[PDB]
Amino acid sequence: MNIFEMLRIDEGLRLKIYKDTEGYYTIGIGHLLTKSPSLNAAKSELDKAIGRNTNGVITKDEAEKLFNQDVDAAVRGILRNAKLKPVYDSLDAVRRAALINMVFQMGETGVAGFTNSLRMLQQKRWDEAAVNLAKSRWYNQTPNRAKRVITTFRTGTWDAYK
Ligand SMILES: [Cl-]
Ligand SMILES: [Cl-]
């Protein structure tokens, strides 16, 4: 198990524009295209992202390319963020993937807002951090996925993904 296989499990793979759990046009492995309700606006984002006139449909190779960029963007978002980087630096490799997962799902700004959970993670109070993480819109809206990520923070193992 690693961050790519982990996010692949959580995001699925779909080759045509679909709507994510919030109703936002998305494609590939969880690649958010736009929060606009215009399918046309989403298709324009897709053409721009891929670099060609798509029919709202991409290949698997293209979906994996956006995935690679997006994982890389999540890591670099963590490392540029003054609240996220110290927590990331403080974690082991498994829990680091759990943080990348949250940033991939919600963005750098959103996760950097989990101030109290971040402090408990940096303090390595895993059970407490796990309880605090669950007290969130994130947990309530995507509870099975949040449970998996939270179990990864709580245990420092991949048990939720096997
Ligand atoms: Cl992009
Ligand atoms: Cl879920």
Residue 49: give its domain's CATH number. 1.10.530.40
User: In which domain, by residue range, is 138 found?
Assistant: 3-155
Q: Say if 160 falls within a structural domain.
A: no
Catalytic residue list: 11, 20
Is 161 part of any domain?
A: no
Ligand 2 centre to CA of 143 (Å) is 5
Residue 127 CA to ligand 1 center (angstroms) comes to 36
Q: What burial letters (b/e) apply to 20-50, b meaning 16+ CB within 10 Å?
A: beeeebbbbbbbbbbeeeeeeebbebbeebb
- 């974690």: which residue's tokens? 91
Question: Two tokens at 28?
Answer: 């590939």
Q: How far is the CA of 130 from the centre of ligand 1 (A)?
A: 32
Contact 161, 6 (CB under 8 A): yes
Domain assignment present for 60? yes
| 111 and 17 Cβ atoms separated by less than 8 Å | no
Residue 41 forms part of a structural domain:
yes
CA separation for the pair 19, 11 (Å, rounded): 12
* Half-sphere exposure of residue 120: CA atoms within 13 angstroms, side-chain side: 16
Q: How was this structure determined?
A: X-ray
Rounded to whole angstroms, how far apart are CA atoms 79 and 156?
Answer: 21
The answer to whether the CB of 121 falls within 8 A of the CB of 95 is yes
Report which secondary-structure segment, H or E, holds 153: helix 143-155
Classify residue 56 by its DSSP letter.
Answer: S
Looking at the CA of 50, name the nearest ligand: 1
Residue 30 contacts residue 10 (beta carbons within 8 Å): yes
49 C-alpha to center of ligand 1: Å? 4
In a domain, 80, yes or no: yes
Unique residue bearing structure tokens 């290949």: 59
Q: How many domains does the chain have?
A: 1
Q: Where are the beta strands (DSSP E) in the chain?
A: 14-19, 25-28, 31-32
SS3 content of the chain, % helix, strand, coil (to 5): 65, 10, 25
Distances (CA, A) of 107 to 91, 102, 111: 19, 7, 7
